[PDB]
Structure formats: C-alpha cells, structure tokens
Amino acid sequence: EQELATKMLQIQSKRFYLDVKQNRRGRFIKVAEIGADGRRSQIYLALSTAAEFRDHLSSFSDYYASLGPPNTDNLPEDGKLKSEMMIKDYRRYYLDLKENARGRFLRVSQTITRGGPRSQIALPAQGMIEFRDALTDLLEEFGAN
C-alpha cells in the first residue's frame, strides 16, 4: 500500500488528513478526521467521487455564506439545511449541512448498499473552501477525468 500525497488541514480545533493512496484495489483518497474531543474517524473515496464531492463543496459554500447568523429559533427537527447524495456502485455518500448548538458542519456519511461497514466525518462549514481547494489540487495531479 503506497502513499502518493498528503494534505493536512486545521479547521475550528479539528484536524483533517487527505491521503492519496494506492494498492492492488486501485487508487483512492482517504480522509481522516481528528475531533475537537479527540475522536478519530475516516472515509474513503474513489477519485471520481472525490471530483463530484469537490463540485458539491462549491455549492454548499454558497449556501453557507447566504445564511447569516442563527436564530430566530426554528431549525428543521433533524437539523439539516441542505442535502446531496453521491453514488459509487454499492457505496452511498450522504452530504448533509447540519446546524447544531456548537455551529454549522457538513456531515459526510459513507454506507454500503446492502448494507455493512458505515462511517462519517463532520467538516466544520468554515472549512469547506479549504477542503474543496485541497481536493482540487490532489485531483489536478492524480485524477485525469
């Protein structure tokens, strides 16, 4: 298993690692999160999904910037403000911009159709452009389209 590139981002007290990697099952991007409380979690993306994710990020950013401060005091019961879904064979990815007490974050959940092993990262909304730009330049180099 070879590591082709890494990007590290510090966002509102968390860290994120974006690693481009390669093994006999192909090339992919691993995204690892270190929580504000220390909690570790990871998701894995094919390069085609990472390009699709990168495009969604521009759109989630415009939405985020249009919001202004909270509240008023009326959120949707589940907490979700904007949603997308990405598909890669048997893998599904839910992108939900949520708003809780601590603030705004893009929750990204990876599931497998059947299903099976699930996992998520929670990207503070202030970091969406940094994450987007980090994806864009890993993809310039490693993802041909």
- Residues of this chain that interact with Cl ion (CB under 5 A) are 11-12, 25, 89-91, 126
Is the Cα torsion angle 26, 56, 139, 107 positive or negative in sign?
Answer: negative
Nearer to Cl ion, 90 or 103 (CB): 90
Nearer to Cl ion, 38 or 117 (CB): 117
What DSSP string describes 93-112?
EEEEEEEETTEEEEEEEEEE
**Residue 27 C-beta: closest distance to Cl ion, Å:** 11
**Residue 9 C-beta: closest distance to Cl ion, Å:** 9
Nearer to Cl ion, 60 or 140 (CB): 60
Answer for the pair 110, 29: CB distance below 8 angstroms, yes or no.
no
**Residue 22 C-beta: closest distance to Cl ion, Å:** 10
Q: How many Cα atoms sit within 13 Å of 75 on the Cβ side?
A: 16
The set of residues, in sequence order, having a beta carbon less than 8 Å from that of 140 and lying 6+ positions away, is none
Nearer to Cl ion, 59 or 90 (CB): 90
Burial class (CB in 10 A: 0-12, 13-18, 19+), 80: middle
**Residue 125 C-beta: closest distance to Cl ion, Å:** 10
CA distance 30 to 2: 12
